[PDB]
Amino acid sequence: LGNANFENFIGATEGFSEIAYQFTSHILTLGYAVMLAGLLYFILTIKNVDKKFQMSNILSAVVMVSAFLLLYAQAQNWTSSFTFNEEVGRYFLDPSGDLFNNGYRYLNWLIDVPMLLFQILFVVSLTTSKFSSVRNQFWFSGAMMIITGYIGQFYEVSNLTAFLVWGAISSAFFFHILWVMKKVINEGKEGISPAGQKILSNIWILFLISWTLYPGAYLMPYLTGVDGFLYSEDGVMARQLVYTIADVSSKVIYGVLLGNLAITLSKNKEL
C-alpha cells in the first residue's frame, strides 16, 4: 500500500503532521494557481511582440494550459489521498482513496519539456547550427530524460539502487540538454543588442538553476542518509516545495524573460 512512492510510504507508516499535510497542500495549490495567472498573462501580452516571435508566446500559453490542468489534478490527488486519524492526530494513506500518484507531474514534464526547449528557437536566431538539428536533439534527449526518470521513479521505495541508477541515466540526458542550450544561447547572443544579450544571460542562469532543481527534489529524501532528517515527511515537504519553485521558474519566469527578449529584438528597435 505504501509501495508506489515515498509519499505513500511515509503516509502509510508515520503519517503526516497537520503542518506537513497542510503545507504541501498549500504549495501545490499555489503552483496551479500561478499557472492559470500565467496563462492569462501570456494570452494578453501576445500583441506586445512582433508576429515572427509569437510562436514563443503560443508555446508559453499551451505550457500554462497543461501545467494548470495537471498540477491542479496533482493538488487534488494529494488532499484526497490522505485522511486524518483522530486517535493519533496525523494524516494517513487512505485505502479508499486512489493513493498519491507521481503520474500527473511526470506527464506534465513529458508534455512541457519539449515545448520549453522549442520556444527559445522562435525568439533567438541560431548562427552555425541547424534549427532542425537543435530541435531534434532537444526533443529526443528531453523525451529520454523524463522517460528514464519515470522508470527510476517506480523503484524509489522497493529498489533504491534502481532508483538512482535510472536517475543517473536520466541525468546523462539532462547534461546533454544543458550542453545544447549553452550553444543555443551563445549563438543567440551574436549580433543582437547588448540589452538582448543581457536578458539572454539571465535566461541561461534561470534555465541552469531551475532545471537543476528537478533532480534536486528527486534526490531530496536521501540527501541526509538512510536515517537522516530528510528521510521523513520533511523530505516530502521540501521535495514538493522545490518542484513547485522549479515549475514556476522554468515555465512562467522563463516565458516572461523570452517575451521581454522578443520585445528587445523588435522591428522598430532597429535603426
Ligand X SMILES: CCCCCCCC/C=C\CCCCCCCC(=O)O
Dihedrals φ, ψ of 76, to 5°?
A: -70, -35
Q: Binding segment for ligand X among 33-41, 135-143, 184-192, 196-204 (CB under 6 A)?
A: 33-41
Out of 28, 252, 262, 265, name the contact with ligand X by CB under 6 A.
252
Going from the C-alpha of 197 to that of each of 52, 65, 258, the distances in angstroms are: 19, 30, 12
Q: Which does 72 bind (CB under 5 to 8 A by kind): ligand RET, ligand X, none?
A: none
**258 near ligand RET (CB under 6 A):** no
Out of 2, 38, 152, 235, name the contact with ligand X by CB under 6 A.
38
Chain position carrying cell 521523513: 232
Out of 112, 181, 221, 255, name the contact with ligand RET by CB under 6 A.
112
**What's the rounded Cα separation, in Å, for the pair 235 and 215?**
14
DSSP class of residue 2 equals -
Going from the C-alpha of 131 to that of each of 48, 121, 212, the distances in angstroms are: 25, 7, 25
Q: Which does 112 bind (CB under 5 to 8 A by kind): ligand RET, ligand X, none?
A: ligand RET
Out of 17, 101, 224, 260, name the contact with ligand X by CB under 6 A.
260
Q: Which does 260 bind (CB under 5 to 8 A by kind): ligand RET, ligand X, none?
A: ligand X
Nearer to ligand RET, 156 or 233 (CB): 156
**248 near ligand RET (CB under 6 A):** no
Q: Is 88 exposed, middle or buried (0-12, 13-18, 19+ CB in 10 A)?
A: exposed
Q: Can you read off the three cell numbers belonging to residue 41?
A: 498573462
Out of 35, 113, 121, 265, name the contact with ligand RET by CB under 6 A.
113
The one-letter amino acid code at 40 reads L
Longest CA–CA separation in the chain, Å: 74
- Chain positions contacting ligand RET, by CB under 6 A: 109, 112-113, 116, 145-146, 149, 167, 170-171, 174, 211, 214-215, 218, 247, 250-251
